[PDB]
Ligand binder design. Sequence first.
Ligand SMILES: O=C(N[C@H](Cc1c[nH]c2ccccc12)C(=O)O)c1nc(Cl)c2ccccc2c1O
Ligand SMILES: [F-]
Ligand SMILES: [F-]
Ligand SMILES: [Zn+2]
Ligand SMILES: [Zn+2]
Length: 231
Amino acid sequence: GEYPTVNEIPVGEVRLYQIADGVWSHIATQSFDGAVYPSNGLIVRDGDELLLIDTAWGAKNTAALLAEIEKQIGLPVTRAVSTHFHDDRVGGVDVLRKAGVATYASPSTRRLAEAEGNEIPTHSLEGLSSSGDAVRFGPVELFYPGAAHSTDNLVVYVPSANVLYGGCAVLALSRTSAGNVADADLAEWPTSVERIQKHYPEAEVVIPGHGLPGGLDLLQHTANVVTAHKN
Ligand SMILES: O=C(N[C@H](Cc1c[nH]c2ccccc12)C(=O)O)c1nc(Cl)c2ccccc2c1O
Ligand SMILES: [F-]
Ligand SMILES: [F-]
Ligand SMILES: [Zn+2]
Ligand SMILES: [Zn+2]
């Protein structure tokens, strides 16, 4: 297996969950402002190498992530993309870089990470500055849906498996709150979700930044939660 939940993962350990052939999520837990949350990222096979989407929310968790990948999959992570500037996405980038992983993020994400005092991916991803932009990166498509959870948030689609990784722009079905909205655009977020809905109508699995994967319902649910919050 079942998808692991927060109480099943001690802080510092990482689980992998097979989503499709050559596609896994990674699940970690971290303490933030005195509460513990689970957090997801993605791993996508690209021949005899792996592409990583997002860190495991901190240096120690990300070291544990690399160890778990080596144990379970046995292929090297050669590139990583961070989908927004918050620490659940970039915290651990230094561990990755020092391990030889080429780390990437949009210029917006890199600027915001630097201003926040967070770790900074090495390389810039151009072609993603306008809402609706899409670029190919190894075995995935990167898509900028517009401002949502943050102004820089990206989503990731795996065409070969019809897997949509929504990152923090997409909420799990059990979420009742938009959560940390300090950097969010609640007015635009439903429109950004609609852009995702329209661009990936064939998605079979949708993975949120935190919590359980599901189907396309997670997209509409997200728009509903964020609109109810704003209201
Ligand atoms: O209030 C939140 N969540 C509650 C609980 C919840 C339900 N389902 C969940 C699935 C995963 C994590 C929390 C949940 C909800 O929406 O009812 C909340 N969630 C996350 Cl992630 C946060 C991350 C970073 C900073 C603050 C956060 C936050 O406030
Ligand atoms: F986040
Ligand atoms: F996120
Ligand atoms: Zn965030
Ligand atoms: Zn909360």
